[PDB]
Structure formats: structure tokens, C-alpha cells
């Protein structure tokens, strides 16, 4: 009987499918004909955008191995060419079905499909994907709207790649929402640009949770009265956080835009505008967009009649062309019957690790849980290594499921606590997920076990992406040493993440909140690098009208809109003009750390910075009680 069948093939399920081949595991793919919302955007001529997340995090160790020499964003035509050419190496082992109905038993599951055919497997593999309404707009669309009005209750990386789609055509926009968290995807460091994901050396957790959150979470929250942070110049965008329940920080159901600063867009794409847009890089600033009035924050209580289709904001009445609502994370699972009968609620809170379903024999979930920042390639990487092992390795297969239910309480506790299950739950910082699912498997590092403060940086500040755990041990992938080497060698080993966390050991979360606003361009949502870039925006309009056909006619008065900016940036009226440090500790942190790399750490004599680099061997926090 076949030991495997996978359900979906589209890219998540690329790195477990290379590791039924490899460990020569009978495996069978069933995957519907119609293929995904990719080729749908390649029919309809629509990959004209690109990813909001990095090479590095966005794409498989045993490509980022012989592809990668350099950070940079891959477009949306990259990523689906990356999924045709691993769909074409599996082609012989992918059915061309639908799977309508599963009916797991004890020892396996039977599989129905739309032809009819049935099919027996031991252990099945669920990667199928999300059915997303914004998929529609994106799509199925026109850019021939102009000058006409849009509201939406929700703000999104959808909602924002659309912003950024209309706004060229003089639209305008109003976020009528519960406010959200936006975050620059690119942060210039001393003048070399990091990604997001980049800094936030996640293993920091384990020294102290309250070290770790006031490192992480100023941008987030609004601890800084720093009048240049977006938060404290438009409120609006201010989110109610009551809910968090958890010393885990960023927590587990925090969901994050991450733009593109206009001033990180400049400094990439400048120099050949048209070629760039045209290849789908595409300004989607939505703190430029709130400064120039672009796009505009309105109370969420500021009723319409959806029935005369107008909005209702100061003294002005404007009737707005469409109204866009949207959230269907929900993943497509077909019907399950739990002993062929019961059918099957999905709850993401109710699985183990994203992927372990609890009435369910041999059945594994992989495509479901949402990176907070970078790309679903870590995710979907740790994923396949954790369900590949319960598939081939019994004991620990027996390991795992003895206590699944305490392993599940033990995790909500440490992650949600007492919070009611909500949309987001599978929304998880990257980095804790990777590690988690790695002290699982066991192809996590010890931090006891580095001998130099190189190897310190190594374990703390190298971003804790998939192929990290690829170096060594079970699921090592050649030239991993190389890609390391490479990557280290083109961010100083990652010692500016190393010298924050060390800089803000003393400091209060309200202390760390100010000295991480300290900047002459903090990292994230500075309203100072905003202005001077409204000559460069204008060649950007120009420039995408001119790859995309368009004349807008830019000399109009929507004189009622100028009326509703100037109404919606009150407080920011009041507040920008009391406008006037991190750059400098740094400075000085990078200056000790790279002069002392190949120091022995327990060796280490006794800026008083040192004596917390010993204890570095030695953290408090380490303990997770889902893992033991
Ligand atoms: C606009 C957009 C932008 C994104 N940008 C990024 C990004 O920048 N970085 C990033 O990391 N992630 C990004 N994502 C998320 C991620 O890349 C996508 O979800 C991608 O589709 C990978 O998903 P998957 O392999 O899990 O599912 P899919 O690509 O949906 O593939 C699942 C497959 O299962 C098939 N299928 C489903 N149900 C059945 C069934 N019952 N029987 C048989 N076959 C079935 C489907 O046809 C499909 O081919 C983005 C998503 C969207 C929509
Ligand atoms: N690696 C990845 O998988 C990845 C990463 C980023 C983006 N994406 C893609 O981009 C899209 C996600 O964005 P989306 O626009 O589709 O919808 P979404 O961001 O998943 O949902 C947004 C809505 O959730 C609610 N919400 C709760 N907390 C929030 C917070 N802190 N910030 C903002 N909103 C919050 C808000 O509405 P209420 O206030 O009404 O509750 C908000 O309008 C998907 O297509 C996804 O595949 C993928």
C-alpha cells in the first residue's frame, strides 16, 4: 500500500517532495489541473508586481545555494517560474485531480476525487493552499478607473499592491479600519541596506522575553512620543493590542504590511525607472501615501449607506466608485472524516506546529502557517524536514504524538495564553517558528556550544532562516557552508543586531523605545525622509504612466478631497512641526565586536558589555515546555 500521497503541489510542498525522493519514500501527488491564483496573474498577463519578501527568505536552501550572490526582492514572475520549474522535475509523480473527500482510519485515510478514482495511502499531506478574495481584484481588475474614489475596512499587503496600482491614476484612497501595523521592508544600516527580517535576531528570546520585547516591539507599539513616528503623527493607524496574552514578543497573530520607503525605492531604482516598474517593482510607500494625502485614515465608526454608496467624513459627502472588504485566510481542505464518518473542524490552535491535527491519523498539514515577516520559504522548509521524519522515522513519529495534547496546551500557553482564538492565530515571527521546529527535529545549535564570539554572532544574530539548520546534521544541503560564508561576509556577520540587543540591556522598554527612535532615520514609519522625495514621486507617477498607457489629465481640483486631507492630518499639523542616539553606541558596539571575532568567549576577562557576552553561553530562557 502507498506509504504517501500529497494533496496540492504548488510550492510548499517542493522541499518535503524532495525529501520522499532522496530518503526513496513511495510517494504520490494529487494536484487539481487548474493549477493556482499564479497562473492565473500569468493568463491574465498580471505578474507586473513583485514579492514584499527576500531572496533569502523566500526561496528554498537548495536553490539560494547555486542562485544566490546578492539581497534582493524577487519579482512575482521569478517566484512563479521558480514553482514551474520544480513542478517540471515532479510532473511524472503529479495525478491531475481533484481531492473532494478524505476518510481517515487508524493505520490510513482513503481519497476520493472529482474523476471518481480512489486512492489508499498510509500518511497524507495536505498543501493546497488559501481561497483569498483580494485574489479577485488582483486577478480580474481594469486601469482604466481614474479620478474616482475607493473606501476599505481593511489594510493589507493586497490592499496596499491595489494602493499602489491606483494611486497613478490620481484615485483616492481612504482606509476606513481598526488602524494596522506597517513596517519599511528595507532599512538602510550604516548605508548597506538589511531587510526587515534581517534584524531580529530571534534566539535574543532565550537571554530574557523582556530583553527581547523592548528590542522589538517600539515600532509596533506606541512607546515612543517621538513626533516623526508615523503612530504618534496619525493615530488613526493606532491598533487596540488587549487581546496579547503571551510574554512571547512580536506575538503569535501579529500581521504586518511591509513597504517600500520611498527613500530605500530611490536608492535601488532611480537610475532606470521605467525598465524597473515595468518589471513589477512597484512604489507602494503607505507613509509617504498618508503624508501626501494620497490616502487618508478615518474613524472605523464613520457610517455610510452603502445603498446611495457615498462616505460621511467632516462636512462633506463624497461618493465613493467602490467599497473593498477582505479576509479569507482559510485554508482549502476538502471534507475530512475522522473513522470515516465525523467530519473534521479545522482550528489552527488545535494542531501541533501548525501541521499535526489531533483526531486524525497519519495527516499533515504544510502551507497553512503565516510568517509575521519574510517569506513562506522558511515555513514551508521547517515544515517539510518535521513532516518528512514523522513520515519516515517512527520513533520519532511515537516521540511527538505520545503527548500531542499537552505538547498543544504547553504551546498555546507559552504563545496565546488565555486569548480567544482569532483569524491571524497562524501568524507566527519566523524565527522563533524555525527554531522551534528545529529543537523538535534536533538540528538546532547549543548556545553553550559556541567557543568564539564569532560563533556567539553565528547563534544570536544570524537570522534564523531554514537553510541555517542546513549546514550540518540530518537534512544538511551541499554548499550551505558557502552560502553562510557569502551572506556573513556581506553584513558583518550580523554584529549591528549583536551591538543593538547589547546596547539596550539596561534600558526600560520606554528607555529602549526612545534611544530606537534616536536616529537620524529610525528604522521604521520616519516621516522625516517623506518630504524631500515629492520631486521623485512625481518623476515615479510620470514613469508608470508611461510603461502602463496612461494620461490622468493632472492639472484637476478634487477640491472636496484636498478638504478631507486637510481634515484627516490635523494632529499631524499640529505635531510634524516639533520635529528636533542609536547611530552613535552602534558605532562603537560594531568597532568592539569586530576587533574581538575570534576571542574564546568563557576565556573572556572579567564596556562591562563583556560579562553579558559570558552569560551569552548561559541564557535563563531557553526552556520550551512544548519541546521536552
Ligand atoms: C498575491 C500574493 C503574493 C504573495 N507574496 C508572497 C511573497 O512575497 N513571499 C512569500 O513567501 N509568500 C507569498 N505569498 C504566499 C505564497 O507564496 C502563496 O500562498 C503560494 O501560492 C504558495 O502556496 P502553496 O504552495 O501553499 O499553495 P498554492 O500555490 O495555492 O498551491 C496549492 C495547490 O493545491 C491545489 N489544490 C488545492 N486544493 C486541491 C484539492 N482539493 N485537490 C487537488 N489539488 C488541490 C491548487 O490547485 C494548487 O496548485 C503570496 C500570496 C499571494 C496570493
Ligand atoms: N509570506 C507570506 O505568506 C505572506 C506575507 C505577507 C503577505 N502575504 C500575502 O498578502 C496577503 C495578505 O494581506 P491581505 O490584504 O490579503 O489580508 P490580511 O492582511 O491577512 O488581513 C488584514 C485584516 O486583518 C485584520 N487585522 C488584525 N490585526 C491586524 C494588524 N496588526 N494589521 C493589519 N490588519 C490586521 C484587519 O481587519 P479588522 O480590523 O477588520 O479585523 C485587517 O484589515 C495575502 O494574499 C498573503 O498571501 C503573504
Redesign the pocket.
Known sequence: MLEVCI????????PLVRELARTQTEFQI??????????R?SESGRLD?????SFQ??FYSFDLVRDYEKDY??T?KQ?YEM?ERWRSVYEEKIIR????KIENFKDYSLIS??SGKTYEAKHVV?????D?L??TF?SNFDNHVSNKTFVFDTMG??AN?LIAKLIPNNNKIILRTNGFTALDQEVQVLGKPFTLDQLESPNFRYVSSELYDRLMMSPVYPRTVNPAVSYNQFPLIRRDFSWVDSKSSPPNGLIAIKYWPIDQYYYHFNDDLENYISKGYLLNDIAMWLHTGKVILVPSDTPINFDKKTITYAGIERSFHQYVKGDAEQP???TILINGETPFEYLYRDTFMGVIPQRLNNIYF???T??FT???????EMQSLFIHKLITQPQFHQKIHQNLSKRITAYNQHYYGAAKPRKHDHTVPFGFYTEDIARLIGIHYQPNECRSVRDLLFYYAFPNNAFKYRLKGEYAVDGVDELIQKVNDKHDHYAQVFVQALSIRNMNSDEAAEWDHSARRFSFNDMRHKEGYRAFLDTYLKAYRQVENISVDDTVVDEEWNFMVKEACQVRDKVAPNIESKDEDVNKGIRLILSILDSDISSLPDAQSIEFIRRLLQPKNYELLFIR
Open positions: 494533496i496540492g503541489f504548488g510550492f510548499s510542498a517542493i494529487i494536484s487539481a489541473e487548474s493549477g493556482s491564483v499564479w497562473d496573474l508586481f513583485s514579492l514584499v519578501s527568505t523566500s526582492y524577487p512575482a517566484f514553482h485531480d481533484f481531492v473532494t476525487t472529482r495536505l498543501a493546497t493552499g488559501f483569498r483580494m485574489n488582483l499587503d493586497s499592491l482549502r481542505l476538502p504544510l502551507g497553512y503565516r510568517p519574510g517569506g513562506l520559504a522558511n515555513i514551508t
